[PDB]
Amino acid sequence: GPLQEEDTFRELRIFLRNVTHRLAIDKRFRVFTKPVDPDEVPDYVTVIKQPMDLSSVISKIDLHKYLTVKDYLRDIDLICSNALEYNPDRDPGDRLIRHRACALRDTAYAIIKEELDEDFEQLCEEIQESR
């Protein structure tokens, strides 16, 4: 019973680790693989209320914080929305970060759309809703 449910969440974790690995090895996304350095960017922690990066995503998968795909994608979305907030200007440095941050998001959504069975996603939801 709960043994079947544990199997479902373990499969979700394996799937999410694989998606996240494919994001993290993409050279476009290197700046999103680690948390910000407070020395390099002192005001980041004050401007961005919910910092998120791919190392933190891996930590949360292993802590069992993602019981659904939607919960995982909320944090992926945070990676892109944080970059849009922190680097909003027209200069090429800001535009490049925004372009990469939301290509990361788009790539994650596209992998899930192509490879995640919708019925598996739905089962994760209905298990979590019964908790």
| Residue 78's CATH number | 1.20.920.10
- Provide the residue type at 73 as one letter: L
* Resolution number, Å: 1.9
Residues 6+ apart with CB under 8 A from 113: none
CA 23 to CA 19: how far, in whole Å? 6
Using alpha carbons, list the distances in angstroms from residue 108 to 15, 47, 54, 77, 131: 12, 25, 12, 9, 27
Which of 113, 110, 41 has the alpha carbon at shortest distance from 82? 41
CA 88 to CA 105: how far, in whole Å? 17
CA 92 to CA 62: how far, in whole Å? 36
- Write the DSSP symbol of residue 52: -
Count up the domains in the chain and report the number.
Answer: 1
Q: Do 104 and 80 touch, CB atoms closer than 8 A?
A: yes
Q: Rounded to a whole number, what is the distance in angstroms from the first to the last CA of the chain? A: 13
CA 131 to CA 40: how far, in whole Å? 42
- Tell me which residue has tokens 């995982």: 72
Residues 6+ apart with CB under 8 A from 102: 80, 83, 84
Supply the range of the domain harboring residue 2: 1-131
- Write the DSSP symbol of residue 34: S
| 3-class SS of residue 26 | coil
CA 33 to CA 26: how far, in whole Å? 10
| 3-class SS of residue 59 | helix
Q: What would the two tokens of residue 45 be?
A: 């922690």
